[PDB]
Amino acid sequence: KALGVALIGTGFMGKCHAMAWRNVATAFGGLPPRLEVLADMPADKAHSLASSFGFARGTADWREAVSDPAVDVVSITTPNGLHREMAEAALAAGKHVWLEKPMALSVEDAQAMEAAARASDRRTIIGYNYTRSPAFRAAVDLIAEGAIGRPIHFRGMYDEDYMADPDLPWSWALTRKDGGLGALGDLGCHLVSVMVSLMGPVARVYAQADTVITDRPHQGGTARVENEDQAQALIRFASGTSGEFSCSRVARGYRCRLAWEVQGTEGTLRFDQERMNELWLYQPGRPEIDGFRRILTGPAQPGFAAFCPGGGHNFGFNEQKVVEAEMLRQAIAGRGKAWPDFTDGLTIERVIHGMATSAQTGQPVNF
Amino acid sequence: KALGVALIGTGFMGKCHAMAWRNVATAFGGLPPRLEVLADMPADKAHSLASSFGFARGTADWREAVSDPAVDVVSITTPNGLHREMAEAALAAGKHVWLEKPMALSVEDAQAMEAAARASDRRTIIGYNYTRSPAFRAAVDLIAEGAIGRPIHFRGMYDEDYMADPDLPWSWALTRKDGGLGALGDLGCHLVSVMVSLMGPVARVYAQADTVITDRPHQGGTARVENEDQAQALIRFASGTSGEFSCSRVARGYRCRLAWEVQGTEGTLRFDQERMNELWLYQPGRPEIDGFRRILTGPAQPGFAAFCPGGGHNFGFNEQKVVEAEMLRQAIAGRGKAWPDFTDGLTIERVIHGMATSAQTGQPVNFL
Amino acid sequence: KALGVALIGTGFMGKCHAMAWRNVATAFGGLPPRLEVLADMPADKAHSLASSFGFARGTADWREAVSDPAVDVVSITTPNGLHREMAEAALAAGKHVWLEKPMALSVEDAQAMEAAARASDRRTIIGYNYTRSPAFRAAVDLIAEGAIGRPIHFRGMYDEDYMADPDLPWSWALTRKDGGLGALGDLGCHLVSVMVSLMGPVARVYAQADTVITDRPHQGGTARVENEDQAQALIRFASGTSGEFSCSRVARGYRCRLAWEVQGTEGTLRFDQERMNELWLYQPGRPEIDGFRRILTGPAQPGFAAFCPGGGHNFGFNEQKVVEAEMLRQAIAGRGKAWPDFTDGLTIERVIHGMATSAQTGQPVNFL
Amino acid sequence: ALGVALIGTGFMGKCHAMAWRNVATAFGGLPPRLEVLADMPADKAHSLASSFGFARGTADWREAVSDPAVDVVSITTPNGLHREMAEAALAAGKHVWLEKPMALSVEDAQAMEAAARASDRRTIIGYNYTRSPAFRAAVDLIAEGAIGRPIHFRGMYDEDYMADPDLPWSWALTRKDGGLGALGDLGCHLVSVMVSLMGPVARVYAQADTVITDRPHQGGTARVENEDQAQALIRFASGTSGEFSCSRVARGYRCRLAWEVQGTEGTLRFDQERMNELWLYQPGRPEIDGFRRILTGPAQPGFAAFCPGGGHNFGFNEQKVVEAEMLRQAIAGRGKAWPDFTDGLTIERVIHGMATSAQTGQPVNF
Ligand SMILES: NC(=O)c1ccc[n+]([C@@H]2O[C@H](COP(=O)([O-])OP(=O)(O)OC[C@H]3O[C@@H](n4cnc5c(N)ncnc54)[C@H](O)[C@@H]3O)[C@@H](O)[C@H]2O)c1
Ligand SMILES: NC(=O)c1ccc[n+]([C@@H]2O[C@H](COP(=O)([O-])OP(=O)(O)OC[C@H]3O[C@@H](n4cnc5c(N)ncnc54)[C@H](O)[C@@H]3O)[C@@H](O)[C@H]2O)c1
Ligand SMILES: NC(=O)c1ccc[n+]([C@@H]2O[C@H](COP(=O)([O-])OP(=O)(O)OC[C@H]3O[C@@H](n4cnc5c(N)ncnc54)[C@H](O)[C@@H]3O)[C@@H](O)[C@H]2O)c1
Ligand SMILES: NC(=O)c1ccc[n+]([C@@H]2O[C@H](COP(=O)([O-])OP(=O)(O)OC[C@H]3O[C@@H](n4cnc5c(N)ncnc54)[C@H](O)[C@@H]3O)[C@@H](O)[C@H]2O)c1
Ligand SMILES: O[C@H]1[C@H](O)[C@@H](O)[C@H](O)[C@@H](O)[C@H]1O
C-alpha cells in the first residue's frame, strides 16, 4: 500500500525530491513511500547516492527506473532536453509522473506530453515549488476570501545573478536548440506559475528581452549565447486586469528574488521568496493604526502545522518540495487534485514561449 | 542683491516653497531671499498667510504680484490648469520661474511655455523634488563613477492611494479637458524625472492604463472619471537599455512609494522614497561577506552637510525643496545650471503623454 | 508682539535652532519670531552666520546676546560646560530659555539651574528633540488610549559610532571635570527623556559601563579618556515595571540608532530613530492576518499636518526642532506646558548620574 | 549504520524523526536505522512508528533504551522526565541526544553530568539555534577577526505563547513540576548562542517578573509561580559586558532570538525570525559605508549539504539535521559534539544563577 518511488537525477532538484520523498509521511502521516530505484550517471555515482539517499538500489539506466514493477511514481529531475522522452516512457509504462519544470524545450514537445498524459490515465504534476510555501498558499486563500477585494494590478519579478559573471563558460543550455529559453525558461516559468495562481489565466502579453553577455568562453575560444539573460512583459489577464512581469539571470546581488504583489480594491498583498516566511497584507484601517501587517509564517497557514506547531520557526525552501510530494500522494490516492498537471503545465509553457515570440516579433501575443 | 520672491499659492506646495525660501540661505549661506509678495484667494487668506509666512504683503491679484518691480523670481504652486497662464505672465514680466509639476495639461501648452522661457532669457526650474534627495544625488554620482558598471535594466514605480477610496468626490481634475492626465500627470512625471536622470533619455514606450473607479459622487449623483488611476510601460532608452515603469493613485497602503532600481553589469542600486534616507548598493564581494549594503544618508551625500553634520539624522521631504531653491538661486547667479528647465521639462511632458497615447492606441510610441 | 530671539552657538544644534526659529510661524501660524542677536566666536564668524541665518546682528559676546532688550527668549547651543553659566545669566536677565541637553556637568549644577528657573518665573525647555517626532507622540497617545494594554517591559538603546575610531583626537569633553559624563551625557539623557515619557519615572537602576578607548591622540602625544564609551542598566520604574537601557558612542555602523520598544499585555510598540517615520504596533488579530503593523508617519500623527498634508512624505530630524520651538512659543503665551522644564530636566540629570554612580560602585541606585 | 531509539513524538519528537531520516541524504554515509519509537499511549506509539518509519512502537520507553539494536537515544519528553530517561540510556550504554533544558534543577543536571562522564558514550543537548549557517558563519567571522575584539553583546529571546491572560494555567507554571519559566524555555537557548559568540559568563545581575500572576483553572484560578520574563547584565570571563533578556509574554514575537556582537572593528547582528540574514558592519569608504545583508548560501557552514544555490531559505527543521550530523560524527570519533552534558551543566548554572540573582536582588558570580 506504500507508494513505490523512482528518482531520475541527483542534482539540485534530484536531491530536493529525494529529501521530500524521505519525509512526506513523517510530516503528513500514512505509509512512508518505498524508495525503490535511483537512476543517475555515471553508475558509481548512482550507487553512492542510492546508498546515502536510502534508495533500495542505484542504476545508470533511467529506463530501469520507469519500468520496474515495484515503482508506482517517477520523479524526473534531469536536464530540460530529455524531459519529453523520460516523461512519455514513464506514462507509457503506467507510472504517475513528478516532472521538474519546464515540461520540455518547445511548446510542440509539451503538447505531445500533454496528449500522452491524458491517454495514460496516470497523475502528473510539474515541480513549481514556489506555489507550495505556507505564505503563498495563505495569500491565495486571502484573495479567495476577499481580503483585498477585487485584484486591479499584478507586479512580479524573479531576479537571480547565477549568470552575471561574463567569464562563466558557454554551455548547451545557452543554445535555442538544446537549451530552449534562457531566463524565461529557468525563472520566468516559476513567476508564471505563481502569477496565474493569484490572477487567473493570461489573455495577452507584450514583451521585450535582452542578452547582456552575448558570447562566453568555450574550449579556448568563445561561443554565442542564443537565449535571453532578462525579459519584461505587460500582461492582460482573462479577467481584463493588468500585470507587470520580469525575470533576470544577471541581476547582481539577487539569489532567489521571486517577488510579487497583488493590488486590490480593498488591500494589497506583497511577498519576496528571499524572505519566504513573511507575507505583507494592507487593508484599510482607522487612521491612527493604518498600515501593512507583517504576517510571519506559522500554523494558521496551509501545510505549516505538518512540519512545526510553533509560529515563526522559519519554513525552508526544501520543505516546499515535501508539500509538493504530499499533493501528488493525495492525487494518486484520489483524495485531491495536483496542480499543475501536464494540461495546466502546457498553458504555462505557451505563456513563456508567447513572451519570447512577442519580444522577437515586437507584436503582442494573445492566448 | 538678495533675491526678491513672489509666491502664488499657499497649499501643499505653496507652504513647501515658503519654508524652502525662508531657510535656503540658513542651509547654503549667502543672503536670505526677500519674501516680497504672497498671492492667494481670497484676499483675507493671502493677508493671513503673508503674515505667518513672513511675506512683506499679501494680494488676491497674482498678476500684480508677478509684475512687482521688487520681485525677481516667482514660485507658482497653483493647480495644473493655471500653470501656463501664470508662467507665461511671469516670464513676460522678466521674472525667473519656479514652476510646480507637471508643466501644464497638454504637450501643446508645454511647447508654448518652453518657447516663452527661451524668449525671456530668464531661468526656469520645475518642482521635480525627488531628484534633490542626498540618496538620489549620491546614486547618480555612484553610476558616474562606474560603481555598478554599465546599466542594463531600470525598474521604477510610484504608488500612492489618495484616490483608492471610491467614495472620494468627483472633481474637474478627473476630466481630460480640465484635469489632463491622471496618475501619469500626478505621479508618473516624477518617476520620469528620476528615471531619465539615472538612465538618460527615453527612445520608446509601450504602455497599458486603467480607470479602476470609473464613476464618483457628484452633486446628488455620479460623474465619469475620464483619466487613468494606474499606468504601466516597458521602456527602451536611447542607450538601448530596457526599463519597467508604473504609477498608481489607487495602490492601497502606499503613501509616497516612488521606488526605483538600476541593475548594472557590476552591481545594483535600489531606493524607496518611503525610506528616503536609505540607498541599497550591491557590488560583488568575497563569498563570506557578499551582500547588499544599506547606505544611510549622511554628510558624504550631496546636499546633506548643509542641513546636519551627523549621519543618520533623517533628511526630510521638505528639505528636498530647500535644495531645489538653492539650485535655482545658483542658476540665477550664473554659478550652476538648474535641471529641469522648461526645455528639459517639455521632454518629460512628451514621455508621459506618449505613454497615455500608447495605452489608448495599443501601439508603441517612439520619441527619437 | 512677535518673540525676540537670541541664539548662542551656530554648530550642529545652533543651525538646527536657527532653522526651527525661521519656520515655526510658517508651520504653526501666528507671528514669525524676530531673529535679533546671534552669538558665536570668533566675531567675523558671528557676523557672517548672522547675515546668512537672517539675525539682525552677530556678536562674539554671548552676554551681549542674552542681555539685549529686544530679546525675549534665548537658544543656548554651546558646549555642556557653558550651559549653567549661560542659562542662569539668561534667567537673571528675565529671558525664557531653550537649553540644549544635557543641562550641565553635575547634579549640583542642575539643582542650581532648577532653583534659578523657579525664582525667574520664566519658561524653560531642554532640547530633547527625539520626544517631538510624530511617531513618538503617536506612540505616547496609543499607550494612553490602551492600544498595548498594561506596559510590562521597556527595552531601549541609543547606539552611535562617532567615537569608534581610536585615532579621533582627545578633547576636554573626555575629562569628568570639564566634560561630565561620556555616552550617558551625549546619548543616555536622550534615551531617558523618551523612556520616562513612555514608562513614567525611574525608581531604581543597576548599571555597568566601559571605556573601550582609554587613550587618544593629543597634540602628537596621548591623553586619558576619563568618561564611559558605553553603559547598560536594568531599570525599575515607579510603576514597578522592568526596563532595559543602553547607550554607546563606539557601536560601529550605527549613526542615530535611538531604538525602543514597550511590551504590554495587549500589544507591543517598537521604534528606531534611523527610520523615524515608522512606528511598529502589534495588537492581537485573527490568526490568518495576525502581525505587527508598519504605521508610516502622516497627518494622523501629532505635528505632521503643520508641515505636510500628504502621508508618507518623510518628516525630518530638523523638523523635530520646529515642533520643539512651537511648544516653547505656546508655553510663553500661556497656552501649553513645555516638557521638560528645568524641574523635569533635573530628574533626568539624577537618573543618568545615578547610572554612572551605579556603574562606578557596582551597587544599585534608588530615586525619590 | 547507527541504531536509533526516539522517545516522544511532539514538537521536538517529530523534529528529531525528520532529522534522523534525512541526515545521510544531506551529509552522506549510511542512513541511521530507525529501530524503536516510544510514546504513550501504545496506539499512538504504533501509528507514529508506522508514519515515522520506525521498525516498532512501544509504550515502554525503558525497554526501547535497553534494545540491543539501539546505539543512540533521542529524548524529546517533557523537562521533568529528562534526568530519569538520560540516566537509564547512559547506564544501558547508549549515546544520548537530549532536548533542552537538561532538567528542572542544577542538582538534577549535576547528577546527569556525572553519569555522562562515568559512561564513555557521547551526549549532545538540543540547542539547535547554534546550528544555522548564519550563526556558524558569525562565529567563524569573529574568530577570523572580521569585527576585531568584542566590546558588547546584546541578546533577547521574545515569544508570546503565554502572552494572552486568557491562556489556561498548567503544571509547567509551578516551580516544583515546571522548574524555571521563560529562563528554562527560552533563556537557555539565548545562553547557548551568547557563550558560543562571547565565551563563558563570569557574573550576572538579573531582574525577573511574573506579570500575569493567576490563570484560568477548573472554572477557578491558579497561581503562576515562575517568571514570564527576565533580564540580566552580564560580565564574560573576557571582562566584556552583555545585555540579556527572555520573555514568554512578549506580544507579536513568535521566535525572536535576536543578538548582536559589537566589536572594535565592526558589528554582527542576527534575528532568528529572519534566520537566513546575517548583518555585518565593517568600516568602508564614506560613499558606500553601511551594514551588509549577508543572505545564507553555500559559503556558510552546513548550507551546501541542503542546497547548492544561495538564497533558497534554510529552515528551522534543517538546524536539527545539522545537529544529528554533529552527533553522528562525534559517535564516529571525527568531531566533538557541543554542548555535551558538561558544557550543558554550565548553561544550567547560568540560567539558575540568573533566577537566584532576580530572587535575592544580588549579583551571582560563576
Ligand atoms: N523547481 C526548482 O526550483 C528548480 C530549480 C532548479 C532546477 N530545476 C529543474 O530541475 C532539472 C535539473 O536541474 P538541476 O539544477 O537539478 O541540474 P543538475 O545538473 O544539478 O541535475 C542533473 C542530474 O541529472 C542526472 N542526469 C543527467 N543526464 C542523465 C541521464 N541521461 N540519465 C540519468 N540521469 C541523468 C545528472 O547526473 C544529475 O544528477 C532541470 O529541468 C531544471 O530546470 C527546477
Ligand atoms: N512636487 C511635489 O511633490 C508636489 C506635491 C503636491 C503638488 N504638486 C503640484 O503643485 C501644485 C499645487 O498642488 P497642491 O497639492 O499644493 O494643491 P493645493 O490645492 O494644496 O494648492 C492650491 C493653492 O493655490 C491657490 N490658488 C488656486 N487658484 C489660485 C489663483 N487663481 N490665484 C492665486 N492662488 C490660487 C489656492 O488657494 C491654494 O493655496 C499642482 O500643480 C501639483 O501638481 C507637486
Ligand atoms: N538635541 C540634539 O539632538 C543634540 C545634537 C547635538 C548636540 N547637542 C547639544 O548641543 C550642544 C552643542 O553641541 P554641537 O554638536 O552643536 O557642537 P558644536 O561644536 O557644533 O557647536 C558649538 C557651538 O557653540 C559655539 N560656542 C562655543 N563656545 C562659545 C562661547 N563661549 N560663546 C559663544 N559661542 C560659543 C561654537 O562656536 C559653535 O558654534 C551640546 O550641549 C550638545 O550636547 C544636542
Ligand atoms: N530545541 C528546541 O527548539 C525545542 C522546542 C520545543 C521543545 N523543546 C524541548 O523538547 C521537549 C519536548 O517539548 P515539546 O514542545 O516537544 O512537547 P510535546 O508535548 O509536544 O512533546 C511531548 C512528547 O513526549 C511524549 N511523552 C510524554 N511523556 C512520555 C513518557 N512517559 N513516555 C514516553 N513518551 C512520553 C508525549 O506523548 C509527546 O509525544 C521539552 O523538554 C522542551 O523543552 C525544545
Ligand atoms: O546624534 C547624536 C545626538 O543627537 C546627541 O545629542 C549628540 O551629542 C551627538 O553628538 C550626536 O551625534
PDB file of N, CA, C and O in Angstrom, chain D residues 227-245:
ATOM      1  N   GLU D 227       8.723  32.662  36.280  1.00  0.00           N
ATOM      2  CA  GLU D 227       8.870  34.005  35.663  1.00  0.00           C
ATOM      3  C   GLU D 227       8.325  33.993  34.230  1.00  0.00           C
ATOM      4  O   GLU D 227       8.580  33.030  33.487  1.00  0.00           O
ATOM      5  N   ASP D 228       7.607  35.058  33.867  1.00  0.00           N
ATOM      6  CA  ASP D 228       7.131  35.322  32.487  1.00  0.00           C
ATOM      7  C   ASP D 228       8.250  35.958  31.666  1.00  0.00           C
ATOM      8  O   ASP D 228       8.235  35.807  30.426  1.00  0.00           O
ATOM      9  N   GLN D 229       9.155  36.683  32.320  1.00  0.00           N
ATOM     10  CA  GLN D 229      10.234  37.427  31.623  1.00  0.00           C
ATOM     11  C   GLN D 229      11.391  37.633  32.596  1.00  0.00           C
ATOM     12  O   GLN D 229      11.158  37.670  33.812  1.00  0.00           O
ATOM     13  N   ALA D 230      12.603  37.752  32.069  1.00  0.00           N
ATOM     14  CA  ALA D 230      13.799  38.048  32.882  1.00  0.00           C
ATOM     15  C   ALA D 230      14.799  38.823  32.034  1.00  0.00           C
ATOM     16  O   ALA D 230      14.856  38.585  30.811  1.00  0.00           O
ATOM     17  N   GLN D 231      15.553  39.710  32.678  1.00  0.00           N
ATOM     18  CA  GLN D 231      16.640  40.484  32.031  1.00  0.00           C
ATOM     19  C   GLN D 231      17.873  40.422  32.929  1.00  0.00           C
ATOM     20  O   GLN D 231      17.713  40.318  34.152  1.00  0.00           O
ATOM     21  N   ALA D 232      19.064  40.487  32.345  1.00  0.00           N
ATOM     22  CA  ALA D 232      20.311  40.416  33.129  1.00  0.00           C
ATOM     23  C   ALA D 232      21.384  41.277  32.474  1.00  0.00           C
ATOM     24  O   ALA D 232      21.423  41.333  31.231  1.00  0.00           O
ATOM     25  N   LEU D 233      22.215  41.921  33.293  1.00  0.00           N
ATOM     26  CA  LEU D 233      23.526  42.447  32.838  1.00  0.00           C
ATOM     27  C   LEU D 233      24.565  41.346  33.044  1.00  0.00           C
ATOM     28  O   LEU D 233      24.492  40.634  34.071  1.00  0.00           O
ATOM     29  N   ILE D 234      25.467  41.200  32.075  1.00  0.00           N
ATOM     30  CA  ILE D 234      26.473  40.101  32.011  1.00  0.00           C
ATOM     31  C   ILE D 234      27.869  40.715  32.077  1.00  0.00           C
ATOM     32  O   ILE D 234      28.083  41.779  31.463  1.00  0.00           O
ATOM     33  N   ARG D 235      28.783  40.047  32.778  1.00  0.00           N
ATOM     34  CA  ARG D 235      30.242  40.174  32.541  1.00  0.00           C
ATOM     35  C   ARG D 235      30.747  38.804  32.107  1.00  0.00           C
ATOM     36  O   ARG D 235      30.465  37.816  32.820  1.00  0.00           O
ATOM     37  N   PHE D 236      31.431  38.741  30.969  1.00  0.00           N
ATOM     38  CA  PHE D 236      32.069  37.497  30.480  1.00  0.00           C
ATOM     39  C   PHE D 236      33.412  37.347  31.191  1.00  0.00           C
ATOM     40  O   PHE D 236      33.904  38.331  31.772  1.00  0.00           O
ATOM     41  N   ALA D 237      33.973  36.142  31.162  1.00  0.00           N
ATOM     42  CA  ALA D 237      35.329  35.847  31.681  1.00  0.00           C
ATOM     43  C   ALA D 237      36.344  36.786  31.017  1.00  0.00           C
ATOM     44  O   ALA D 237      37.335  37.154  31.668  1.00  0.00           O
ATOM     45  N   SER D 238      36.086  37.177  29.769  1.00  0.00           N
ATOM     46  CA  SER D 238      36.895  38.143  28.978  1.00  0.00           C
ATOM     47  C   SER D 238      36.903  39.534  29.622  1.00  0.00           C
ATOM     48  O   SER D 238      37.780  40.333  29.251  1.00  0.00           O
ATOM     49  N   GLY D 239      35.922  39.836  30.481  1.00  0.00           N
ATOM     50  CA  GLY D 239      35.714  41.171  31.077  1.00  0.00           C
ATOM     51  C   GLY D 239      34.671  41.980  30.316  1.00  0.00           C
ATOM     52  O   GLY D 239      34.278  43.060  30.802  1.00  0.00           O
ATOM     53  N   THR D 240      34.227  41.476  29.165  1.00  0.00           N
ATOM     54  CA  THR D 240      33.309  42.187  28.243  1.00  0.00           C
ATOM     55  C   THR D 240      31.909  42.208  28.856  1.00  0.00           C
ATOM     56  O   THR D 240      31.565  41.283  29.613  1.00  0.00           O
ATOM     57  N   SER D 241      31.150  43.253  28.540  1.00  0.00           N
ATOM     58  CA  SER D 241      29.770  43.478  29.033  1.00  0.00           C
ATOM     59  C   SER D 241      28.770  42.766  28.119  1.00  0.00           C
ATOM     60  O   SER D 241      29.068  42.540  26.928  1.00  0.00           O
ATOM     61  N   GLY D 242      27.603  42.446  28.664  1.00  0.00           N
ATOM     62  CA  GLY D 242      26.482  41.909  27.885  1.00  0.00           C
ATOM     63  C   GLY D 242      25.160  42.374  28.445  1.00  0.00           C
ATOM     64  O   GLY D 242      25.093  42.711  29.650  1.00  0.00           O
ATOM     65  N   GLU D 243      24.150  42.408  27.583  1.00  0.00           N
ATOM     66  CA  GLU D 243      22.726  42.537  27.963  1.00  0.00           C
ATOM     67  C   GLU D 243      22.017  41.269  27.501  1.00  0.00           C
ATOM     68  O   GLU D 243      22.364  40.750  26.428  1.00  0.00           O
ATOM     69  N   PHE D 244      21.050  40.807  28.285  1.00  0.00           N
ATOM     70  CA  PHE D 244      20.380  39.504  28.093  1.00  0.00           C
ATOM     71  C   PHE D 244      18.928  39.651  28.534  1.00  0.00           C
ATOM     72  O   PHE D 244      18.676  40.280  29.565  1.00  0.00           O
ATOM     73  N   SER D 245      18.000  39.088  27.775  1.00  0.00           N
ATOM     74  CA  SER D 245      16.584  39.010  28.204  1.00  0.00           C
ATOM     75  C   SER D 245      15.911  37.806  27.557  1.00  0.00           C
ATOM     76  O   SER D 245      16.396  37.321  26.522  1.00  0.00           O
TER      77      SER D 245
END
